[PDB]
Amino acid sequence: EDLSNYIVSNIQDPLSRTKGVGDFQVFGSQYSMRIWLDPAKLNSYQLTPGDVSSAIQAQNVQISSGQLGGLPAVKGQQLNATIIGKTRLQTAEQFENILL
């Protein structure tokens, strides 16, 4: 799995843009965030996979926030900066600490 992930994330796209290659098939995958539900728990807290999903869909989001120097601005304004709202997660810890 380790190797497969290199290939795809690193040498795949360069290869796929190399002159002459018209198609390619990788024997493996690149990584992904894996969420392994367990009904032996879902059950307890009386929860469904559907309830999960919808959470991930709302807690692992890259959101269009805005900026303080908002354009069109107000006369005199002299402070412009991008405000960055919720930005999606990288690590499992971040994925482990989402509230259902």
Binding-site ranges for a second copy (CB under 8 A): 3, 6, 9-23, 58-59, 61-88, 98-99
DSSP H or E run through 66: strand 66-67
| Of 24-32, 41-49, 71-79, 81-89: span binding ligand LMT (CB under 6 A) | 24-32
Q: Which stretch binds ligand LMT (CB under 6 A): 22-30, 46-54, 68-76, 77-85?
A: 22-30
> Distance between CA 17 and CA 49 in Å, rounded?
39
Which is closer to a second copy, CB of 12 or CB of 47? Answer: 12
d(CA 48, CA 46): 7
